[PDB]
Amino acid sequence: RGSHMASTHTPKWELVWEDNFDGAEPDTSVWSRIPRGKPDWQNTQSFDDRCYEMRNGLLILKGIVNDNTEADAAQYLTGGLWTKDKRAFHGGRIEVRARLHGAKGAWPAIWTLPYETDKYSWPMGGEVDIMERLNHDSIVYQTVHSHYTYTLGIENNPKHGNTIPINPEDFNVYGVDFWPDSLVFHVNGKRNFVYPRIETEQEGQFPFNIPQYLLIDMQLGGSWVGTVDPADLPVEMEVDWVRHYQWK
Protein backbone atom coordinates (compact mmCIF):
# COMPACT_ATOMS: atom_id res chain seq x y z
CA ARG A 1 0.00 0.00 0.00
CA GLY A 2 0.96 3.74 0.49
CA SER A 3 4.75 2.87 1.07
CA HIS A 4 5.23 -0.96 0.83
CA MET A 5 3.58 -3.27 -1.67
CA ALA A 6 0.97 -6.05 -1.86
CA SER A 7 2.93 -6.94 1.45
CA THR A 8 3.09 -10.53 -0.06
CA HIS A 9 3.37 -13.06 2.81
CA THR A 10 2.51 -16.67 3.67
CA PRO A 11 -1.01 -16.49 5.16
CA LYS A 12 -1.25 -17.26 8.93
CA TRP A 13 -3.57 -16.92 11.98
CA GLU A 14 -3.85 -13.10 12.58
CA LEU A 15 -5.39 -11.79 15.88
CA VAL A 16 -8.17 -9.40 14.60
CA TRP A 17 -9.88 -8.91 18.07
CA GLU A 18 -9.43 -9.83 21.76
CA ASP A 19 -10.97 -9.11 25.17
CA ASN A 20 -8.69 -9.62 28.27
CA PHE A 21 -11.48 -8.47 30.70
CA ASP A 22 -9.25 -5.56 31.93
CA GLY A 23 -11.93 -3.05 33.13
CA ALA A 24 -14.10 -2.49 36.23
CA GLU A 25 -16.81 -4.19 34.09
CA PRO A 26 -17.46 -6.00 30.77
CA ASP A 27 -16.88 -3.63 27.81
CA THR A 28 -20.46 -2.34 27.21
CA SER A 29 -19.74 -1.83 23.49
CA VAL A 30 -19.18 -5.63 23.19
CA TRP A 31 -21.10 -7.42 26.00
CA SER A 32 -24.61 -7.34 27.56
CA ARG A 33 -25.98 -9.50 30.40
CA ILE A 34 -28.20 -12.33 29.15
CA PRO A 35 -31.90 -11.99 30.02
CA ARG A 36 -34.26 -14.68 31.42
CA GLY A 37 -35.93 -17.02 28.89
CA LYS A 38 -37.88 -20.32 28.70
CA PRO A 39 -35.29 -22.89 27.38
CA ASP A 40 -33.42 -25.02 30.04
CA TRP A 41 -30.21 -22.98 29.43
CA GLN A 42 -31.90 -19.55 29.79
CA ASN A 43 -34.14 -20.53 32.82
CA THR A 44 -31.79 -19.04 35.41
CA GLN A 45 -30.27 -16.10 33.45
CA SER A 46 -30.30 -13.00 35.70
CA PHE A 47 -29.37 -9.26 35.87
CA ASP A 48 -28.52 -9.84 39.60
CA ASP A 49 -25.06 -8.31 40.41
CA ARG A 50 -24.38 -11.36 42.62
CA CYS A 51 -23.99 -13.43 39.37
CA TYR A 52 -21.13 -11.25 37.94
CA GLU A 53 -17.60 -10.28 39.12
CA MET A 54 -14.39 -8.78 37.63
CA ARG A 55 -11.52 -10.19 39.75
CA ASN A 56 -7.75 -10.14 39.13
CA GLY A 57 -8.30 -9.25 35.39
CA LEU A 58 -10.71 -12.31 35.12
CA LEU A 59 -14.43 -12.26 34.26
CA ILE A 60 -16.45 -14.33 36.87
CA LEU A 61 -19.94 -15.65 36.09
CA LYS A 62 -21.71 -17.42 39.01
CA GLY A 63 -24.58 -19.81 39.68
CA ILE A 64 -26.30 -19.18 43.09
CA VAL A 65 -29.41 -20.19 45.08
CA ASN A 66 -32.14 -17.52 44.52
CA ASP A 67 -33.79 -16.04 47.69
CA ASN A 68 -36.92 -14.74 45.77
CA THR A 69 -40.25 -15.93 47.35
CA GLU A 70 -42.18 -14.47 44.34
CA ALA A 71 -44.20 -17.45 42.80
CA ASP A 72 -42.52 -16.75 39.35
CA ALA A 73 -38.89 -16.97 40.72
CA ALA A 74 -36.19 -19.30 39.31
CA GLN A 75 -34.86 -21.65 42.03
CA TYR A 76 -31.31 -20.70 40.83
CA LEU A 77 -29.72 -17.56 39.27
CA THR A 78 -26.82 -17.65 36.72
CA GLY A 79 -24.72 -14.94 35.04
CA GLY A 80 -24.11 -14.79 31.27
CA LEU A 81 -22.78 -12.29 28.70
CA TRP A 82 -23.46 -12.16 24.91
CA THR A 83 -22.24 -10.00 22.01
CA LYS A 84 -25.75 -9.95 20.46
CA ASP A 85 -26.40 -6.62 18.63
CA LYS A 86 -22.80 -5.46 19.56
CA ARG A 87 -20.07 -7.68 18.00
CA ALA A 88 -20.40 -10.10 15.04
CA PHE A 89 -17.85 -12.89 14.37
CA HIS A 90 -17.37 -13.58 10.59
CA GLY A 91 -16.02 -17.15 10.81
CA GLY A 92 -12.30 -17.44 11.68
CA ARG A 93 -11.03 -19.02 14.94
CA ILE A 94 -12.88 -18.16 18.19
CA GLU A 95 -11.01 -19.15 21.38
CA VAL A 96 -11.95 -18.63 25.03
CA ARG A 97 -9.63 -19.40 27.97
CA ALA A 98 -11.61 -20.39 31.10
CA ARG A 99 -11.25 -22.23 34.41
CA LEU A 100 -14.32 -24.28 35.57
CA HIS A 101 -15.47 -25.59 39.02
CA GLY A 102 -17.40 -28.89 39.61
CA ALA A 103 -21.01 -28.62 40.94
CA LYS A 104 -23.92 -31.10 40.57
CA GLY A 105 -26.38 -29.51 38.07
CA ALA A 106 -23.88 -26.99 36.65
CA TRP A 107 -23.32 -26.88 32.82
CA PRO A 108 -21.46 -23.66 31.92
CA ALA A 109 -21.34 -23.14 28.11
CA ILE A 110 -19.38 -21.16 25.46
CA TRP A 111 -21.28 -21.03 22.18
CA THR A 112 -22.43 -19.07 19.13
CA LEU A 113 -25.76 -18.31 17.39
CA PRO A 114 -26.47 -16.31 14.18
CA TYR A 115 -25.75 -12.57 14.65
CA GLU A 116 -28.66 -11.67 12.29
CA THR A 117 -31.50 -12.58 14.75
CA ASP A 118 -34.31 -11.17 12.49
CA LYS A 119 -33.03 -13.36 9.57
CA TYR A 120 -32.42 -16.83 11.09
CA SER A 121 -34.50 -19.22 13.24
CA TRP A 122 -33.32 -21.95 15.69
CA PRO A 123 -32.27 -24.51 14.76
CA MET A 124 -32.31 -23.84 10.96
CA GLY A 125 -29.80 -20.94 11.46
CA GLY A 126 -27.48 -23.30 13.31
CA GLU A 127 -25.83 -23.45 16.77
CA VAL A 128 -22.12 -24.03 17.62
CA ASP A 129 -21.29 -25.24 21.16
CA ILE A 130 -17.56 -24.43 21.72
CA MET A 131 -17.80 -25.76 25.35
CA GLU A 132 -20.34 -27.52 27.62
CA ARG A 133 -19.09 -29.00 30.96
CA LEU A 134 -21.62 -31.11 32.96
CA ASN A 135 -21.51 -31.60 36.74
CA HIS A 136 -17.95 -32.63 37.88
CA ASP A 137 -16.88 -34.17 34.47
CA SER A 138 -13.16 -34.13 33.46
CA ILE A 139 -14.43 -33.93 29.81
CA VAL A 140 -16.31 -31.25 27.79
CA TYR A 141 -18.76 -31.60 24.89
CA GLN A 142 -18.24 -29.73 21.64
CA THR A 143 -21.39 -29.90 19.39
CA VAL A 144 -23.33 -28.40 16.43
CA HIS A 145 -27.14 -28.28 16.09
CA SER A 146 -29.09 -27.52 12.89
CA HIS A 147 -32.31 -28.29 10.94
CA TYR A 148 -30.42 -31.42 9.81
CA THR A 149 -29.24 -32.66 13.26
CA TYR A 150 -32.33 -31.62 15.28
CA THR A 151 -35.47 -31.22 13.05
CA LEU A 152 -34.57 -34.11 10.61
CA GLY A 153 -32.90 -36.16 13.41
CA ILE A 154 -29.64 -36.88 11.49
CA GLU A 155 -27.16 -36.53 14.46
CA ASN A 156 -24.57 -39.24 13.56
CA ASN A 157 -23.97 -38.95 9.72
CA PRO A 158 -21.89 -36.96 10.11
CA LYS A 159 -21.25 -37.12 13.92
CA HIS A 160 -22.59 -33.75 15.27
CA GLY A 161 -20.65 -33.84 18.59
CA ASN A 162 -17.71 -35.34 20.52
CA THR A 163 -16.19 -35.22 24.04
CA ILE A 164 -12.52 -34.57 24.86
CA PRO A 165 -10.80 -34.62 28.28
CA ILE A 166 -9.77 -31.37 30.04
CA ASN A 167 -7.57 -30.42 33.03
CA PRO A 168 -10.68 -29.73 35.15
CA GLU A 169 -8.90 -27.70 37.91
CA ASP A 170 -6.89 -25.60 35.33
CA PHE A 171 -7.52 -23.00 32.60
CA ASN A 172 -8.22 -24.66 29.23
CA VAL A 173 -8.58 -23.01 25.78
CA TYR A 174 -11.89 -23.88 23.98
CA GLY A 175 -11.81 -23.18 20.21
CA VAL A 176 -13.71 -23.65 16.91
CA ASP A 177 -12.41 -22.82 13.39
CA PHE A 178 -14.99 -21.79 10.71
CA TRP A 179 -14.18 -22.85 7.09
CA PRO A 180 -16.45 -22.93 4.00
CA ASP A 181 -16.60 -26.78 4.03
CA SER A 182 -16.15 -27.64 7.77
CA LEU A 183 -15.96 -26.61 11.43
CA VAL A 184 -12.89 -27.83 13.46
CA PHE A 185 -13.15 -27.97 17.31
CA HIS A 186 -10.05 -27.71 19.56
CA VAL A 187 -9.37 -27.92 23.30
CA ASN A 188 -5.84 -26.56 24.19
CA GLY A 189 -4.86 -26.77 20.47
CA LYS A 190 -5.72 -30.53 20.30
CA ARG A 191 -8.30 -31.32 17.55
CA ASN A 192 -11.51 -32.81 19.09
CA PHE A 193 -13.50 -33.42 15.86
CA VAL A 194 -14.44 -31.99 12.44
CA TYR A 195 -18.06 -31.22 11.43
CA PRO A 196 -18.08 -31.50 7.61
CA ARG A 197 -20.30 -29.90 4.95
CA ILE A 198 -21.44 -33.07 3.08
CA GLU A 199 -23.23 -33.57 -0.24
CA THR A 200 -26.77 -34.45 0.94
CA GLU A 201 -30.24 -34.76 -0.68
CA GLN A 202 -31.55 -32.52 2.22
CA GLU A 203 -31.02 -28.90 3.33
CA GLY A 204 -29.78 -27.03 6.42
CA GLN A 205 -26.82 -29.44 6.90
CA PHE A 206 -24.21 -26.57 7.00
CA PRO A 207 -25.73 -23.14 7.83
CA PHE A 208 -22.72 -21.99 9.93
CA ASN A 209 -20.77 -19.66 7.48
CA ILE A 210 -22.87 -16.64 8.56
CA PRO A 211 -21.99 -13.93 11.09
CA GLN A 212 -22.13 -15.22 14.72
CA TYR A 213 -22.61 -13.69 18.17
CA LEU A 214 -20.82 -15.27 21.18
CA LEU A 215 -22.49 -16.39 24.44
CA ILE A 216 -20.53 -17.27 27.63
CA ASP A 217 -22.81 -18.18 30.54
CA MET A 218 -23.20 -20.23 33.70
CA GLN A 219 -26.16 -22.62 33.58
CA LEU A 220 -27.82 -24.66 36.40
CA GLY A 221 -30.21 -27.65 35.92
CA GLY A 222 -32.17 -29.15 32.99
CA SER A 223 -33.01 -32.60 31.59
CA TRP A 224 -29.45 -33.13 30.22
CA VAL A 225 -27.33 -32.17 33.28
CA GLY A 226 -29.73 -33.59 35.93
CA THR A 227 -30.71 -32.15 39.33
CA VAL A 228 -28.84 -29.30 41.09
CA ASP A 229 -27.25 -29.96 44.54
CA PRO A 230 -27.51 -26.55 46.26
CA ALA A 231 -24.69 -27.74 48.61
CA ASP A 232 -22.33 -27.27 45.57
CA LEU A 233 -23.35 -23.56 45.26
CA PRO A 234 -22.34 -20.93 44.78
CA VAL A 235 -20.30 -21.99 41.68
CA GLU A 236 -18.16 -19.89 39.29
CA MET A 237 -16.57 -20.07 35.84
CA GLU A 238 -13.55 -17.75 35.37
CA VAL A 239 -12.77 -16.31 31.93
CA ASP A 240 -9.23 -15.06 31.23
CA TRP A 241 -9.88 -13.94 27.59
CA VAL A 242 -11.62 -14.29 24.21
CA ARG A 243 -9.47 -14.23 21.05
CA HIS A 244 -10.64 -14.03 17.43
CA TYR A 245 -8.20 -14.89 14.60
CA GLN A 246 -8.53 -14.91 10.78
CA TRP A 247 -6.33 -16.99 8.41
CA LYS A 248 -4.82 -14.31 6.06
Numbering used by the authors: -6 to 241
Q: Would you copy out the relevant sentences from the publication that reported this structure?
A:
Here we describe the discovery and characterisation of endo-acting glycoside hydrolases expressed by mucin-degrading members of the HGM that are able to cleave the O-glycan chains of a range of different animal and human mucins. These O-glycanases display endo-β1,4-galactosidase activity and specifically target the polyLacNAc structures that comprise the main backbone of many mucin glycan chains. All of the GH16 enzymes comprise a β-jellyroll fold, characteristic of the family, consisting of two β-sheets composed of β-strands that form the core fold, which were superimposable with other GH16 structures previously published. Overall these data reveal that the nine GH16 enzymes analysed are endo acting β1,4-galactosidases that display a preference for polyLacNAc structures found in mucins and other similar glycans such as KS.
BF4060 and BACCAC_02680E143Q have four fingers and BACCAC_03717 and Amuc_0724 have five out of six possible fingers that have been observed previously in other GH16 structures. In contrast, BACCAC_03717 and Amuc_0724 both possess a finger 2 (in addition to 1, 3, 5 and 6) and this has a more variable topology than the other fingers. This could reflect the flexibility of finger 2 in this enzyme and could potentially come down over loop 1 in solution like in the Amuc_0724 structure. The structures for BACCAC_03717 and Amuc_0724 are more accommodating of milk oligosaccharides and have more open +1 subsites. BF4060, BACCAC_02680 and BACCAC_03717 also displayed some very weak activity against laminarin.
